[PDB]
């Protein structure tokens, strides 16, 4: 598309190596800008990375580590912003891309468009076949105002380097090609100006540019240093509302814009909440609370008294340090319809934690979540009590928003479990991110969930492996109850359909309601089947009801 979100796995090892690259391809496939962290680790020696090839910006840092591919095709990456930084120092880290037990290893960074690095430094280390890194004039890459220009490059090798291309002026190259010559854009400019495309003052870049320029104007930039608001680079985006100089009453500003990453945006993108000031967020500002229009979206707005308290999940005010959901906190979810944060259930949880005398969580305390219907951050389940065949305690969960993703990528994660089906019946949407369901031996009924319906953005997919094989499910009989419209269920039975192509008596499908026959006697409304009065018509006559009380049941 245009923008994608990065990941935040750091150096931690891919739970599903067999889906790991397949993950990456999904996230970055069409992607030109990654709001987040470009993290490429653990990639196996013969591994197509052609999808990486459209990326120009990386809003935070870039981490290439523990790989064996020999190329990582980011020729087009042009500026990193180092919003966030690896080990809090580095906007670009390549570590340990070697061999551990026609050699393996990255041979040339080839970062041949990389002229801008706004914040953070460069750490390159332990890369056996890596050539030309010490050819590079790093201070030309680092921005002027870049506070963190410290740099930590290793040169130990186990192979040797051809010369740079004859076209290399000064022989500094990202690789053996002419294409890889380090373009200089900061140290060679006329006057003190921070970027330029040539030695003449006439070549100096507009002060709002970042990586270079095709010209003198703030329309001629390679990347904006602040905000791209159309063809033009500016320091900030037009405000949302202009005031009346006497009254000081807000007036809707016709040419006003929101800010999303480093762009001046007309309207906030799908899963982000818009805001009073003019910013797009994943978390509201200090003194606000979430709104919703009939228009399906959400906004932040300020509140009437110091705000009505709400449930905070893990990764949040108060639980932001806690790894897992556990007996010591299970109570804190007493009857919440919506959790700001995430829930994760680890081995840690259901096993004890004698390290600080905290008790093993019981399969029945989990029922606190039966009222639960919205999760803003992700759901992550990795242990789960053998007793329970499913995730029914979340059978009223209706949206996982993804605003905070596990390891930067996964809104839904079920792994190493013992469950036999899923039972998230009312789960109609995963707001952002991808599902990873892997290594659950007994898991049937995955195939039935119409996962395409839950997803919102096309960088989204289910990644599954090492589950019970569908063949072994269709075979051993387990399948969608015939009353489940279009064949989609979350498990065995008529309780578990995603849609009912007949009626709904409670949480169950029924081919007909009791308006003709049938004992505890009944009536029909919005495809449902509601009971009539404890004493209305006991008859065998025609259409014997119409309603709940003795108000409307014709006697």
């Amino acid at each position, epitope marked *: 598309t245009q923008v994608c979100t990065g990941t935040d796995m750091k150096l931690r090892l891919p739970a599903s190596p067999e889906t790991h690259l397949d993950m990456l391809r999904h996230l970055y496939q069409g992607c030109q800008v990654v709001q987040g962290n470009l993290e490429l680790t653990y990639l196996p020696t013969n591994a197509s990375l052609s999808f990486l090839q459209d990326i120009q910006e990386v809003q935070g840092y870039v981490l290439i580590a523990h790989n064996q591919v020999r190329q990582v095709p980011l020729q087009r990456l042009r500026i990193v912003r180092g919003t966030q930084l690896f080990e809090d120092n580095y906007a670009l880290a390549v570590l340990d891309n070697g061999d551990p037990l*026609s*050699p393996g290893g990255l*041979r040339e960074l080839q970062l041949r468009s990389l002229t801008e690095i706004l914040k953070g430094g460069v750490l390159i280390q332990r890369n056996p*076949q890596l050539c030309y890194q010490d050819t590079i004039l790093w201070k030309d890459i680092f921005h002027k105002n870049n506070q963190l220009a410290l740099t930590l490059i290793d040169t130990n090798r*186990s*192979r*040797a*380097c*051809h*010369p740079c*291309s*004859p076209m290399c002026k000064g*022989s500094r190259c990202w690789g*053996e090609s002419s294409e890889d010559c380090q373009s200089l854009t900061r140290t060679v400019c006329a006057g003190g100006c921070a970027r330029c495309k040539g030695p003449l003052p006439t070549d100096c870049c507009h002060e709002q540019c970042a990586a270079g320029c095709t010209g003198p104007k703030h329309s001629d930039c390679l990347a904006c240093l602040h905000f791209n608001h159309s063809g033009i680079c500016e320091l900030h985006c037009p405000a949302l509302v202009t005031y009346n100089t006497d009254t000081f009453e807000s007036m809707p500003n016709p040419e006003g814009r929101y800010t999303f990453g480093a762009s001046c945006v007309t309207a906030c993108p799908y899963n982000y909440l818009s805001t009073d000031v003019g910013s797009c967020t994943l978390v509201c500002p200090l003194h606000n609370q979430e709104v919703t229009a009939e228009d399906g979206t959400q906004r932040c707005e300020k509140c009437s008294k110091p705000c009505a308290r709400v449930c905070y999940g893990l990764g949040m005010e108060h639980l932001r340090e806690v790894r897992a959901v556990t007996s010591a906190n299970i109570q804190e979810f007493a009857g919440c319809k919506k959790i700001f944060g995430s829930l994760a259930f680890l081995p840690e949880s259901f096993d004890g934690d004698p390290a600080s005398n905290t008790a093993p969580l019981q399969p029945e305390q989990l029922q606190v979540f039966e009222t639960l219907e919205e999760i803003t951050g992700y759901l992550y389940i990795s242990a789960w009590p053998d007793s329970l065949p499913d995730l029914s305690v979340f059978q009223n969960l209706q949206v996982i928003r993804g605003r905070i993703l596990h390891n930067g990528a996964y809104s839904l994660t079920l792994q190493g479990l013992g469950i036999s089906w899923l039972g998230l019946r009312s789960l109609r949407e995963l707001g952002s991110g991808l599902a990873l369901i892997h290594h659950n031996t007994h898991l049937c009924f995955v195939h039935t969930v119409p996962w395409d319906q839950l997803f919102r953005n096309p960088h989204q997919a289910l990644l599954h492996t090492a589950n019970r094989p569908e063949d072994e499910c269709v075979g051993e009989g387990l399948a969608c109850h015939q009353l489940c419209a279009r064949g989609h269920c979350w498990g065995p039975g008529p309780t578990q359909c995603v849609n009912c192509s007949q009626f709904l008596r409670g949480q169950e499908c029924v081919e007909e309601c009791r308006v003709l026959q049938g004992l505890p006697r009944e009536y029909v409304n919005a495809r449902h089947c509601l009971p009539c009065h404890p004493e209305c018509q006991p008859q065998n006559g025609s259409v014997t009801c119409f309603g709940p009380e003795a108000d409307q049941c014709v006697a």
Partner: antibody
């Protein structure tokens, strides 16, 4: 250790084609470039060209053009200088060497190729 | 195409010591710093000393020291340890992605 071992010496008649071999060992063969230089009897060194043993890219001499071809074969760790349409005077010593920073640090033993009528 | 120039000439006196010269154009040594030197004894491969303009492989004697303003190109031997006589070769990298050798010079000590 590091070994570059070349063919036994050659004798070829005018109009024929030469084909020396160079087998490297004890170092990772794909990792380095290999170059060819020759020395006509009691005379100057003359660079012929070099090969990428990793990707197969080749630069040649501009005097030999039309007439040279270097190749490698990763499976067997060997490089193959080939000089066609030999006419005298190519008579020389014909080393192959392992290329560092534009510069060769490990040579072959040599290969006398003699071209007289 | 299109050889660098040296003199076959250096001479010099045991103990110390003189310098060879290269030299060649902007397109070769006068533009690249991939400039290397070789010591060839009669009827042997060349020995590699030194590379990048000024640097010595392991085992190479102290006070082998090439450097200088391009377009030259200047190897220097300092104590004339007795047996240093050899033909001596400069080479450079090239705006045509080619290696190019100098004509060689014959070092020859006195006594």
């Amino acid at each position: 250790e590091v070994q570059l071992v070349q063919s036994g010496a050659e004798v070829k008649k005018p109009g024929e084609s030469l084909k020396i071999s160079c087998k490297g060992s004890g170092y990772s063969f794909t990792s380095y470039w290999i170059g060819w230089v020759r020395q006509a009897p009691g005379q100057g060194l003359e660079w012929m060209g070099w090969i990428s043993a990793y990707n197969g890219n080749t630069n040649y001499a501009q005097k030999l053009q039309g007439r040279v071809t270097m190749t490698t074969d990763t499976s067997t760790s060997t490089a193959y200088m080939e000089l066609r349409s030999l006419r005298s005077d190519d008579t020389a010593v014909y080393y192959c060497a392992r290329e560092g920073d534009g510069a060769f640090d490990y040579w072959g033993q040599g290969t006398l190729v003699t071209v007289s009528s | 195409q299109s050889a660098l120039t040296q003199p076959a000439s250096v001479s010099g006196s045991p103990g110390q010591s003189i310098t060879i010269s290269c030299t060649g154009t902007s397109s070769d040594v006068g533009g690249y710093n991939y400039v290397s030197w070789y010591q060839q004894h009669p009827g042997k491969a060349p020995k590699l000393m030194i590379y990048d303009v000024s640097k010595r492989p392991s085992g190479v004697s102290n006070r082998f020291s090439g450097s200088k303003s391009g377009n030259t190109a200047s190897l220097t031997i300092s104590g004339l340890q007795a047996e240093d006589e050899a033909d001596y070769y400069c080479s450079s990298y090239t705006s045509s992605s080619t290696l190019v050798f100098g004509g060689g010079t014959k070092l020859t000590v006195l006594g």
